[PDB]
Structure formats: C-alpha cells, structure tokens
Amino acid sequence: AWPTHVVCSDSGLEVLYQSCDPLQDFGFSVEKCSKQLKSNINIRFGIILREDIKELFLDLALMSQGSSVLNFSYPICEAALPKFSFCGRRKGEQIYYAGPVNNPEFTIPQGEYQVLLELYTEKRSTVACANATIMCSEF
Amino acid sequence: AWPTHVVCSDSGLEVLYQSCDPLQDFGFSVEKCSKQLKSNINIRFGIILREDIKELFLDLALMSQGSSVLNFSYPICEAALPKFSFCGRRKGEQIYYAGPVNNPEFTIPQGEYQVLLELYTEKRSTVACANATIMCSEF
Amino acid sequence: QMCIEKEANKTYNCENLGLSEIPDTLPNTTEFLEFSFNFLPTIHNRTFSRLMNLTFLDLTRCQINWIHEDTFQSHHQLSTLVLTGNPLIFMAETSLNGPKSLKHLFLIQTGISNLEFIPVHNLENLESLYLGSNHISSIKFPKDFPARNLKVLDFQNNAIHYISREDMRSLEQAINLSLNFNGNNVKGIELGAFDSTIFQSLNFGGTPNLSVIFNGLQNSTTQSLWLGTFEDIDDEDISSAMLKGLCEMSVESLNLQEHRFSDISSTTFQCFTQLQELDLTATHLKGLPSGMKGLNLLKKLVLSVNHFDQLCQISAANFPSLTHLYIRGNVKKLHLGVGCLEKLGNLQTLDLSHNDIEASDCCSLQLKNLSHLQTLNLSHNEPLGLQSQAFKECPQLELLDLAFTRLHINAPQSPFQNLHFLQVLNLTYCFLDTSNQHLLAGLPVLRHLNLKGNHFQDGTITKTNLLQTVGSLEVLILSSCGLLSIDQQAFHSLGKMSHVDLSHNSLTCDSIDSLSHLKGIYLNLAANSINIISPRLLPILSQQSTINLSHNPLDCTCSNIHFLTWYKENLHKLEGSEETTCANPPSLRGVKLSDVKLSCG
Amino acid sequence: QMCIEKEANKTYNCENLGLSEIPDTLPNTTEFLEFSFNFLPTIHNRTFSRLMNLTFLDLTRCQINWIHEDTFQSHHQLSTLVLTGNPLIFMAETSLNGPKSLKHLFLIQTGISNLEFIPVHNLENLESLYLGSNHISSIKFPKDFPARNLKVLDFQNNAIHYISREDMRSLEQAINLSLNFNGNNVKGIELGAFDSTIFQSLNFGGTPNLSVIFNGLQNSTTQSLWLGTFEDIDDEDISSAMLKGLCEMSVESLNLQEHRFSDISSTTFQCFTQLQELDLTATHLKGLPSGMKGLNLLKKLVLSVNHFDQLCQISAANFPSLTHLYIRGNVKKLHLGVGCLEKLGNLQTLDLSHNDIEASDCCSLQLKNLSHLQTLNLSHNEPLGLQSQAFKECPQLELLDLAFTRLHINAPQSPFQNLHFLQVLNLTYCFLDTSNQHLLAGLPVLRHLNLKGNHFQDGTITKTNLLQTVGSLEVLILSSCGLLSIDQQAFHSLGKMSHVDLSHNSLTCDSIDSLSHLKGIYLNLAANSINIISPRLLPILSQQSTINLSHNPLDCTCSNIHFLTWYKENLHKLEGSEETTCANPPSLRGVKLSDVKLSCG
Ligand SMILES: *[C@@H]1O[C@H](CO)[C@@H](O[C@@H]2O[C@H](CO)[C@@H](O[C@@H]3O[C@H](CO[C@H]4O[C@H](CO[C@H]5O[C@H](CO)[C@@H](O)[C@H](O)[C@@H]5O[C@H]5O[C@H](CO)[C@@H](O)[C@H](O)[C@@H]5O)[C@@H](O)[C@H](O[C@H]5O[C@H](CO)[C@@H](O)[C@H](O)[C@@H]5O[C@H]5O[C@H](CO)[C@@H](O)[C@H](O)[C@@H]5O)[C@@H]4O)[C@@H](O)[C@H](O[C@H]4O[C@H](CO)[C@@H](O)[C@H](O)[C@@H]4O)[C@@H]3O)[C@H](O)[C@H]2NC(C)=O)[C@H](O)[C@H]1NC(C)=O
Ligand SMILES: *[C@@H]1O[C@H](CO)[C@@H](O[C@@H]2O[C@H](CO)[C@@H](O[C@@H]3O[C@H](CO[C@H]4O[C@H](CO[C@H]5O[C@H](CO)[C@@H](O)[C@H](O)[C@@H]5O[C@H]5O[C@H](CO)[C@@H](O)[C@H](O)[C@@H]5O)[C@@H](O)[C@H](O[C@H]5O[C@H](CO)[C@@H](O)[C@H](O)[C@@H]5O)[C@@H]4O)[C@@H](O)[C@H](O[C@H]4O[C@H](CO)[C@@H](O)[C@H](O)[C@@H]4O)[C@@H]3O)[C@H](O)[C@H]2NC(C)=O)[C@H](O)[C@H]1NC(C)=O
Ligand SMILES: *[C@@H]1O[C@H](CO)[C@@H](O[C@@H]2O[C@H](CO)[C@@H](O)[C@H](O)[C@H]2NC(C)=O)[C@H](O)[C@H]1NC(C)=O
Ligand SMILES: *[C@@H]1O[C@H](CO)[C@@H](O[C@@H]2O[C@H](CO)[C@@H](O)[C@H](O)[C@H]2NC(C)=O)[C@H](O)[C@H]1NC(C)=O
Ligand SMILES: *[C@@H]1O[C@H](CO)[C@@H](O)[C@H](O)[C@H]1NC(C)=O
C-alpha cells in the first residue's frame, strides 16, 4: 500500500489521501485549507501518465456517515472539448498542474467524509485512483 | 572498461574511441568525414557532468608508432573568458553540444594513430577522458 | 515473468515487469511488443537482435540513457518506435539504421534541447515525428533532414516563441502537414513564414496572442486551424480587429473554444467567408446578433457549452447554408421556442443533447421547417411530451436519438408515425409504456431499434407485442429490460434480424426458442440466468454466426453435458469466451467452460 | 559501504556508491555530506533521521522522484540542499520545513515547468536559488514567494524569451539581486519592466539582440552587466545604434566579449561615459579610434584576445583616469612601441602576458611615464633584453611577473635596481645566468622570489651567490633547478625566510645544512636524491613548522635509524606522509615510513 499524504491539518480540518493504483503513487496539494472554500480553487498535481489522456474522465463518490450522498462522472479531457492545457499529453509523460478546478463556492458541515476519485480513459484504463478522508470539527 | 564507439569507418578513414573515465561513458559524433579535416569542424557531444564546468581545460596527446607527435593544453571555459554557451554549467547536469570547435585545419597522413583527450577542472578533476584510435590509409 | 499473450506468436505485453533484457521465452516471430516501464539503461546491437521481425516497439519510460551504434540494424520491418520519457543522453549516428520503412517515431519528453540530437540518415520514410515536452525553442531542423513523407509534426508543450522563414524552410518538402504547437508561447512570427506551404492541421492551443497567429499565417493554406484556449489559461477578449487576418488566409475549419468575445456584433465574423466549419464551444455566448456578415456559406457550426436561454437567441437567419448544427450541453436550461430554426432549410444534422430541454408538446412547433433533417439528437434531456406524428416537420429523418430522455406518449398514439425513412431509433431509458401496441407504427423501413432500460408487463414479451409493426428490423437491443421470459413466437414477424442483444436480463435457456426461425445472427445472452441449455436448443445455436454466453450461472455437471461438448466444438462462434464460467458444481465455480472436460457414458 | 572521510566525524563523501539508504557507519555528528549519484527514488521523514546535525547535503542525481512531508523536519541545521539532476515529480508542501535557516537551494535540471512546483513555506531565509536547465519560460513567482533575503537568482539554460512588468514585480522584495539569464533567448522585455530597479549583477550571456536588452533596461541601475556572446552563437554586429540605451542606464561594469563591432568609430562609445569597467575580450578589434568621447573616466579596461599589432593602436589618450589595463593573449604578435602608454599617468596594474612580445632593449622607452605602476605582468612572452634600471620608469613597482619569459641580461648589470618597493618577483623558467652576482642588487624590500627552472653552474650554489643581496627575503622557490648540492653557508645572509621550496632536484642530506639558522619554515624537499639523513640534521628539521619529504629514495635500514624514529614522532610536521616511501630493502620498498618499524635498540 502507498503512504497516506497530508493535504490539510490546519487545527480543525484534516484532509488525507492515498493512491489506490497498485502501480504508482501521485502527488496532490491545495493552495489553502479552510472550512469555507471559494469558487475555482487552486490545486497542485504531479504524476507519470500510464495512458494517453486525450480522453480523460473523473468519477467521484462522496460519502457522509454511511449514506452515499453524491455519485458523479465528469469529463476532464475530450476530443471535442479539452478543458485543460494538459489534455492530449501522452503515455509516459510527467505531468505537473498548478491551477483551478471548476468548483462552486461551497462550505462543508462538521463530521467525517470518505471520498473515492478515479481518473480513467476511454477504455476505462486507470490514470489515477485516490482514497481520501475529510475530518471537519469546531470553529 | 567501456565499449568502443565508431566515429568513422568509410573507405579508409577509421576513427574509434573509448572512455577512460571509469565512472561513465560519453557520446561523441562528427558531422562529415574525410582525410581533409576542414577548419572549424562541427561535432556532437553528450555527457553527464561529474563536476562544475566554470573552469574547464583540455589536454590532447597525439601519438604514432609508439612516440609522441603533438602535445597541447587549451582552455575551453574560464571565468575571464567563457568560450562556449555550455560554460558555467554545473555538476549533475546533462549536456548536449552540437556546434563548431574552432580547430586549425589538420593534415593527417596515412598511418596508425592514438589520441588521448582529457577534459579537467581547476582542481584537475576529470570531466571526460577519451582514448581514441585513428586508422588512415590511401584515398 | 511473465508476459501477457494477446496473439499467437504475434502480440505480447511486458509492461511493468522491471526486466533488464528481452525474455528468452518470447517467440522469434513477435511483431507487436509492449515493453514500457522496464529497465534498459543502454540499448545496443544485441538487446533486441533475436526478435528480427518486430514492427511495433514501445520502450516508454525504460530509463534509456544510450542508444548505441546499429541497435536496429537487424530490424528491417520496424515501423513504430516509442521512446517517450527516456532520459536519453546520446543517440548514435547509425542507431536507427536498419528498418526499411520506419514510419513513426516518438521522442516525447526525452530532454532534447537541440534538434541535431536526432540521427538523420534513416528518417526518409518518417510519417510521424513526436517531439513534445522537450527543451525545444526553435523548430529549425538541420539540413539533410527529410520531410517529404512527413504528415504529423508534434511540438506540444515546448518553448517555441518565434517562428522564422528559415525555421519553416526546413519543411518545404512536406505537403498536407499537421503541425502541433499546442502549449507553447508564440509571441512572434516572421511575416509570411507559412507561405505557399499546404497544411492539414495547425494547432496553436493556448497561444498568448491570436493576432500574431493570424497575421503570421498570411498567404497560407490549411484545412484545419485550432486556436482554442483552456480553463486554466488567462486570455484577452477577442475583438473583431484581431480576426482581420483571416481574409488573407485559406482556412476550411476553425476552432476558437474557451475564448471570450469583446462586444459581439454584425461585422465580427466578416472575414469568415471562406470557412466551412466554425467551432465556438464554451465561448461564453449569451446569443448571436442578427444580420451577421460572413457566415452565409458556413456548413457546420458548433455552439456547445454556451449560455443560451432560447434557441432563437442563436439567430439562425445568419446561417442559411448550414448542414450541421451542434448545440450540446448548454450551461443553462435550454428552451426550444417556436420555429427558431425555420430559416435553416439545408440542415441535415441537429444535435441538441444534454441541454435539460423540457417540452410538454413536441416537436412540430419546435422543429418547424426542418424538411432536410436526417439526423436528430435529443438524448440526455428532461421529459418530452410526444404527440402522434411528433416529427411531422422532419419527414426525411434517418436517425433519431432520444436515449435517456423520458417520453410521455399516450395510448394508442404513434409519435414516430410518417417517418418513412427512419432507420435508427435509440430509446434507451425513455421509460416507455411498452403495452402500447401502436407505439412503433408508421416506420416501414426501421432496421435498428434500441429499447434498452425499458420495462415490460410481467417482465415478459408475449406473442402480441411492440415489435410486430417493425417487420424490417435487423438490429434489436433489449438489454437491461428485466426480462424473465420471451414467448417462442414473439419475434416471428421479425424475419430479417441479424443482431439480437438480450444481455443483462434474467432469461433462462427457454429464451433461445424465440430464435429458431433465424440464421447467421449475433446473439448476446450475457449476464442472464442461463444454467442448463437442453440439447434441443443446440441446433438453434448452431444456426447462428456468433454467440455470447458470458457471465451466466452456467451448469458444469452431467445434466448439461450436450452443451459443454458443443461449446468446445463451436469456439470460433463464441464471444467473451474467457468470461464464460461455471457456477456449479461449487468445485468449478470460476472455471472457464473451455477448460471443462467431463465424462459420463 | 564504504564512504570516504575528509574530516573526522564532520565531512564525508558517499559519491558513486549506489546506496539505497544512509549507511549505519556514518557518525551522528556529520555536518557535510556529499551523497551524489546514489539511489533515492523517494525521500521521507526517516531518510536522514540519524544525521540531525547536517548543514550541507548534496543529493545530486540520486534519481529522487518524491520528497514527502516533513522530510527535513528534524534538520534545524541544514543550510545547503543540492537537488540537481533529479527527476522530481512532486515536492510536498511541508517537505522543506524544519531548517531554521535554509540559505542555498539547487534545483538545476529537475524538470520544473512551473515555479509553483517549489514549496514556499520555508524559503524566507533563502539567499541563493538555482533554477537552471529546466522548462521555465516565465520568471513570475507566486504571490506567497519570499524573496526579501534573496541575493542570487540563477536561470541559466532556460527558455525565457520575454520579461514582463508582472514578472519583475514578483521580485521587488529582493534588494541588490544578482539575476543570471545566461543561455536564455530574451527576444523582448516589456518597456519599463526594469524601471527604478537596482541590481548587483545582470547576466544576459548569449542574448540574440542587444538593442532589446539596452531598450528594456532603461532607467535601471546595475553594478555588473554581462552581455557577452560565445563562439558557438551566431553574431549580430554591434553598431552605434545598438548601444543607444546605455545613455539612459546606470551601469558600472560592462562585458561585451566575443561580440563584433561594425562600423566601429569614435561615436560607438558615446554612451559609455559613466562606465567604471569595460571588458572587450575577443571583440576582433584591430584598434581603438582616437579623440574618443565617452571613456574619459574609465578605471579598468580589458582588451584581451584582440588583433592589435602595436600598443599605440589602442589609443591610450582616451583613458586618462585608467588604473587597470589588461591585454592578455593577443591573437597576433604584439609590439610595445615607444611611449604608447605615456598618457596613463594614474595606471596601477598593467597585464601584458601571452602576447609574444619581443624586446631587445627594455623597458624604459616602452613603459615611459608609468610612474604610478604597482603591478606588472610580462609573463609568457618571447625573450626580453634588460639592462641596468630596466624598470626605471616604474619606481613604485610592488609585483613583477616575468614567468616563462626568457631574459637577456649581461653581467654584471642589475636590471631590477632602484626598485625600492618591489616585494614579489616571479622569474620561473627565465633561463637566467645565475653566476651574475649582481642580478638582484638594489632590492631592499624583496620578500618573495621564484627561481623555478633556472640553471646553476655545476648544479651547485656557492657560499657567495646571487641571493646574498636580498637579505629581506621570506619566500624562496628553487624547485626544478637541477641542483646537486647547496653550500652550508649559501643562505647565511637570509635569516628571515619562512618558505623554502627545493623540490624536484637531485639534492642529498648535506643540502639540509644550509637551513640550520632557519626556524619555523615551510620546507619542501620532495622528489630529490635524499638517502641517509645524518643524526646531526634532525635538530635542523625539528626547528621547522612543516616539512615535505615525498618521492625520495630514503634509507630504511639500521644506518638511518635516528631519522626513522624522528619521522614517526613528528607526523604533525610532515606534509604528504601517506606519499613518502622507502627505497631499500627491495621487497619493503613502497611502504609508508609511518608503517615501517625496525629493530636496533
Ligand atoms: C600574470 O599572467 C599570467 C598568465 O596570463 C598568470 O598566470 C596564471 O596564473 C594562474 C594562478 O596562479 C594560473 O591558474 C591556475 O590554473 C590551473 C590550471 O592551469 C591550466 O591552464 C594553464 C595555462 O594554460 C595556458 O598557457 C599555456 C602555456 O603558455 C598554454 O599552453 C595554454 O594553451 C594556455 O594558453 C591559452 O590560454 C590563455 C588564457 O585563456 C591565453 O592567454 C593564451 O593566449 C592561450 O590561448 C595550463 O598550463 C595548465 O596545463 C598544465 O597543468 C595541468 C594541471 O594543472 C596539466 O594537466 C597539464 O598537462 C599542463 O601541465 C603542464 O605544466 C605542468 C606545470 O604547470 C607540468 O607539471 C606538466 O608536465 C605540463 O608541462 C592548465 O590547463 C588551475 O588548476 C589552478 O588552480 C589552483 O589554484 C586555484 C586558485 O588559484 C585553486 O582553486 C585550485 O585548488 C588549484 O590549487 C590555478 O587556478 C594559470 O594557470 C596561469 N594562466 C596562464 C594563462 O598561464 C598570472 O597569474 C599573472 N600574475 C599576476 C600576478 O597577475
Ligand atoms: C447524441 O448525443 C449523445 C450525448 O451527447 C451521445 O452520447 C455519447 O454516446 C457515445 C457512444 O454511445 C459515448 O461514447 C462512449 O463513452 C465512453 C466514456 O463515457 C464517459 O462519459 C459518459 C457521458 O458523460 C456525460 O453524460 C453523463 C450522463 O448524464 C453526465 O453525468 C456526465 O457528467 C457527462 O456529461 C457532461 O459532459 C458532456 C459532454 O462533454 C456535456 O454535454 C454535459 O453537459 C456534461 O458536462 C459517462 O456516462 C461515462 O461514465 C459512465 O461509464 C463509465 C464506464 O465507461 C463508468 O466508469 C462510470 O462510472 C459511468 O457509469 C464516462 O465518463 C467510452 O468509454 C466509450 O469508448 C469506447 O467506444 C469507442 C467507440 O465509440 C471506442 O473508440 C473506445 O475504444 C471504447 O471502446 C465511448 O466513447 C459517449 O459517452 C456519449 N456522450 C455523452 C456526452 O453522453 C450520442 O452518441 C449522440 N448520438 C448520436 C447518434 O450521435
Ligand atoms: C443511440 O444509438 C445509436 C445507434 O446505436 C448510437 O449512435 C452511435 O453514436 C456514435 C457517435 O457518438 C457513432 O460513433 C456511431 O456510429 C453511432 N451508431 C450508429 C449505428 O449510428 C448512440 O450513441 C446512442 N445514443 C446514446 C446516448 O447512447
Ligand atoms: C608568479 O608568482 C606570483 C607570486 O607567487 C603569482 O602571483 C599570484 O597570482 C595570483 C593570481 O594569479 C594572485 O591572486 C596572488 O595574489 C599572487 N601571489 C602573490 C604572492 O602575490 C603569479 O601568478 C606567478 N605567475 C605565474 C605565471 O605563475
Ligand atoms: C422554409 O424553408 C424553405 C427552404 O427550404 C423556404 O423556401 C421557406 O421560405 C421557409 N419557410 C419559412 C417560414 O421560413
């Protein structure tokens, strides 16, 4: 198993993640840690690609308590619509991204949250796989 | 030591080299190839630097029939005169060089030759070491 | 140890095995080899020498530092070499000599800073050169470098800021060249650098200044020009003054995605007269003005991912020549309005998917005057109330996509009536009332129907059913319909069928009876409840060309003996053979049927 | 296993070992560690846990891909981290947290494409940032990047083509910064990006267009401005028009090496009015125009590697305030002429080495009126004839270098007479006539004399010799002189010497006699013919501070016992102990005198 990395630990909320891809680990960071996040937050992402990301899709599963709150799929890179500059980069390339993700200005209540994130190609080949935990407390 | 590389091997003209630096090999390549060595010839060079080349010097020894024909030392990089664009580059850097050497036009007659080339720093630390063999015949 | 086999003596995958050399277990006749993520610090005249018949070599991320003299001398049939992501220090002068016709070379992210790095005298047959993600700021190739066969030249994610005449002259031998400058920072181009050179595609994705590109592309000829930006790149708004250079250009297709327009007006597109296709995806459009000049002869228009409230806001009168219109995934909920596209007489293909379109009465007022329409995509929308003859205004329609859009249709109305030319009808997850026997009436030439995700009464298809009106059907999909049984006569009015998909239901062997009157079909019975297939049903299976029986709780006992011997004999007819496993006995649970050899008497 | 010790419990070298971890043998007190060319794919918080006192860490080319959280948390002492040539994929946000004062960071050639890659949280105390050979085309640092203490910012061999106001704004935190843009292709600078700015050094080595640079640096202040090109970079000839911007700049030192001048006239240097130093090395100059305005207040001028025939061609009238003049390695044979430098009344240093200068009578007519001269370099030239008071025109001379330049001096003349201020005299390989007893007369304050490579008659120094006149001497080098014996009273009138070099000769133990009156000296007797050292000579050696005896054919038998015991007692005084060897017995030759132990009594 890959080690668990600390994204946030700012006296209150703790964000942890772990790679579920057996082949490799990856790096991920945020610019700032808070209970209240602004729209279009900035992330940092480092990885070796195991597949061409001409077409890339994200799967998200957010869990609170035990009730599955939210499943969604979203395309990040597409033949008809490359949303980001790194779209169309190829297998074996080392990627580094520092920029926004498209997120609504939203706030999260207190409690424990479990998150699964999968990035995959057209053939459903794994680019990235993440097992993440969010712990929020008093303020 | 290290394997022997071919610089030239067309009708007559026959240039081989071997690295005498136990730590590493390096890549060397010439543009054209003829008995008439034209002035300001273009070379191709590839190496990992095991030292800073802020100050770099070359030793050349030309030999045939078991006797020295030509000795010289010449500076390639100096603080007061960095001759080339790659000067001042540091330990651990990969260098690639393709360009002129500013050599006087040599006339190499028929015979068997051995060339020893040394690139070294102000500390006399080896950057590169070449053990070269030239076999020249009728044209 | 060991490699994955994908074809007899032909294709092998050795990815991620951490090998220092080519396994001596791999056969001599290996043509396609995936050797990425292994460990080859130096490759030489001996490393691949025993696999002389290689055609495709992928050496991605193998940590290659040296490619020595005559490495590929023996490999006369090598067509594709992938060296992406290797820390290459030096390539020998004869390192790529050998292959009679080396077509594709991938040197992406190899640390290349000088184009002189590439060994020149065996690149004559090269069709693709990929040089992305290196340290390249100049595209100037050395002299002696051939470009006559070159069709794809990729410089994605480099640091090219300036393009000169002499830079481009090294490419004069090429015609129909695709150049990719995506992810660069071109801030200057020598005026008329691209003169008389004929390009297939030019990509300047993420380019800082559009003006520089347009001005610099003066007197040039290209089919496709990609000038889109991205969500992560900040751009200045596109003024019409920036788009002037298009008049001095030969362009067929143009992409301007993710850009924002500065005060969009009637003359904004005046230089677009020679253009066939225009892609304005995610261009923050709230609408287009009427009386727009220079778009009169445009054939294809993409307005996907914009901010329209009603279809009339696109001002279709601007585009009388249009044959293809794509408006997919509008950011707002899209309203169709009344006759918004009536002035589009020549339109053949309309895509209105993913728009949250909601209409209680559809679609006569909405698709008014669309008499040339052949392809209509209305899938992934909110519910649509269909009248009888819902598509009266599109008589010439050949393909109708309504997948995942709930349809409110009243019994016994026929919404698709008088579509005498319809061939393809996709109704997956439309929540149809399948008890309406007239639903598919008035489609005399329908040959492809998708009823995936629909419910049937009692989970059964009886003798009198929906499909009786579709006697010309060839492709039928009934996957994920929760079917428990199909009547043996339920497909009797369907004599022409060659593709039947019944996967992801709960059918048993009794379902095969409904196919006895058919020959040479593709039969998909995957993910069902089939365990024993009685020998009386085997001749029916023998009539068919290709059968899938995977993910079935199949019985591997003596009670199912006849089928098991049949299975092994007809292995050429079987799709998903390695996913076809036993459920009983518990002793064989997970075991492929092709491995099973039973004995009785 | 096994590392090399450079200082006990302090400085260790682990280079080229192929270690995957820090060995258990490295002491806890290690402060300086060179760990380059090992194998550390991922470094974490335990990697260097057992070496908490590190101040210098070299991790060059260890194939580091990951630096995890809190890697140096327990390293308060870390001052220099060298990460050059590692393929870094990701660097954790807290990965450099720990060091109370991290002053020097090296991220040269690490694949960096975005300056956001560098963790900012513990860079407040950074003085040196090295970011060369990456994929960097913009120098814009993030908003939360500390630069207040930053003194050196190195961007060598990157892809910076443009410098904006927004780029330079993120560096406004730094005061007196040294920016290195060597090997970059700066095609443009936003006009006003360097407005009101003050820098220590700006290096634009190899820049395509100088006009662009001068243009962009308008209203900026620099101490040093390095604008030279290189032999492998194509030259655009510098006209008077290119140098216009210098009139609107504050520059103290200018370097224009390897550049060419055309059309070169008395107006080329009109803007140079406030340069203090100007370096014109290898600028293909055949001379400098006279009556020139703009070099009136110049202090230092380098005219090395040019094409002068005559010294008068440099037009010395242009530089009245000049204090330093360097003309080294002239491409043509250089001639001194008559009174060419007579207008350089304030000149302090003159360097004219490596020019093939030939002068039969020197040096009054050549150095006329150089009465303020303090340092003169005439080394590595063709032979010079010197009569008595050869340097009469330079009475204030303190250092005279004539090394490797053969001198023609007639006995009994004293060329160096009346040099009352001369302290250092280098005469190595001057082929002097040492039998001339008056050679060094008139030097009351000489303290450093180098006579390396000179011949003494019969290879012997007599009681009466040339050295008698220089009784104030402290340093003497008589190495490589082919000496066989020194008379015991040859250095009698030299009772102030603290450095005697007598290496590479053929002296025996009897030569040590001449050193008896000396105490606390550095004595080098390496590579001689010293065999048995008489017990009378050991009191002489014991009086000295440090003594070298390497490469000598010493006696290691019972006849030389007294010296052998003295040796093992005085290892704190011995230079090159591990390099000293025996000659006899034949089998025991090659063993260090510290290891050799005999049996006598
Ligand atoms: C007056 O002006 C003088 C001349 O301009 C100044 O002289 C300089 O003095 C400095 C400091 O003392 C000295 O610096 C040292 O350099 C060491 C490396 O040396 C290399 O270069 C020299 C010089 O080469 C030039 O000259 C020769 C002979 O004429 C010529 O053949 C060359 O082509 C070259 O000339 C070309 O370049 C110059 C400059 O660009 C042009 O002006 C000229 O036109 C030509 O184009 C070489 O001789 C050396 O080569 C020898 O040594 C190395 C080992 O170091 C050997 O491997 C090699 O084979 C060769 O060996 C031969 O000589 C030795 C004895 O010397 C014999 O044993 C052997 O058998 C051979 O015969 C080198 O290539 C550097 O290592 C050293 O570093 C040490 O000190 C520094 C701090 O100072 C520390 O950091 C280190 O730890 C070291 O301890 C040191 O820096 C220069 O060498 C010398 N310069 C010149 C040009 O001669 C003088 O200083 C000045 N005086 C005053 C008061 O101002
Ligand atoms: C009419 O228009 C419609 C819709 O526009 C067209 O529908 C397309 O149909 C084709 C073929 O049937 C599909 O292609 C196949 O795609 C998969 C990859 O699928 C991934 O995307 C799926 C769609 O995601 C969108 O829609 C969903 C559903 O509402 C939504 O939640 C998403 O957020 C997303 O919508 C967003 O993006 C749109 C476009 O950018 C916007 O318009 C919209 O507004 C939104 O912003 C998605 O469902 C799927 O996720 C599921 O599936 C995977 C398993 O694969 C699973 O892991 C997940 O958990 C989900 O269950 C994916 O993210 C691809 O794998 C296929 O590739 C195979 O086949 C091709 C050949 O076709 C081969 O080349 C390959 O080798 C490979 O074998 C295939 O390309 C397409 O997805 C679908 N598009 C959309 C947008 O729905 C329809 O074709 C049009 N009709 C006609 C006649 O032209
Ligand atoms: C509805 O069914 C049709 C027909 O099977 C699908 O149309 C295919 O769409 C893709 C374009 O994305 C084409 O590559 C194929 O050629 C089309 N097939 C045919 C036969 O025309 C369509 O994708 C289905 N709709 C949805 C939403 O899944
Ligand atoms: C001749 O000897 C002198 C003195 O030993 C050398 O001068 C030294 O040069 C260095 C730099 O080259 C200066 O920084 C030192 O200060 C000088 N030393 C002293 C004691 O003044 C000179 O380099 C020698 N010349 C040659 C050609 O080797
Ligand atoms: C409908 O389109 C036809 C051309 O196909 C045209 O003649 C007619 O005027 C259009 N009608 C309306 C109402 O726009």
Keywords:
heterotetramer; A: mainly beta; six-stranded antiparallel sheet; three-stranded antiparallel sheet; 11 strands; 0% helix; globular; C: 601 residues; three-stranded parallel sheet; 4 helices; 37 strands; binds a molecule of 2 linked components (NAG-NAG); binds 2-acetamido-2-deoxy-beta-D-glucopyranose; immune system; Protein-Protein complex
Describe the structure.
The complex is a heterotetramer, with two copies of chain A (139 residues) and two copies of chain C (601 residues). Chain A has 139 residues and is an all-beta fold. Chain A has one domain (1-139): Sandwich (Immunoglobulin-like). Chain A is built from no helices and eleven strands. Chain C is built from four helices and 37 strands. Chain C is flat. Chain C is mostly beta strands and 601 residues long. The chains are: A mainly beta (139), C mainly beta (601). Chains in contact: A-C, A-D, B-C, B-D, C-D. The B-D interface holds B 23, 48, 50, 80-85, 87-94, 97, 99-100, 102 and D 16, 36-37, 60-61, 84-85, 106, 108-109, 130, 132-133, 156-157, 182-183, 205-206, 228, 230-233, 257-258, 281-282, 302, 304-305. The structure holds a molecule of 9 linked components (NAG-NAG-BMA-MAN-MAN-MAN-MAN-MAN-...), a molecule of 8 linked components (NAG-NAG-BMA-MAN-MAN-MAN-MAN-MAN), a molecule of 2 linked components (NAG-NAG) (2 copies) and 2-acetamido-2-deoxy-beta-D-glucopyranose. A molecule of 9 linked components (NAG-NAG-BMA-MAN-MAN-MAN-MAN-MAN-...) sits between chains B (57, 59, 73-75, 78, 81, 122-124) and D (328-329, 353-354, 377, 379-380, 399, 401). A molecule of 8 linked components (NAG-NAG-BMA-MAN-MAN-MAN-MAN-MAN) sits between chains A (57, 59, 73-75, 78, 81, 122-124) and C (328-329, 353-354, 377, 379-380, 399, 401). Chains C, D: It is a single-pass type I membrane protein. Chains C, D: Residues 8-28 form the LRRNT domain. Chains C, D: It is found in: Cell membrane.
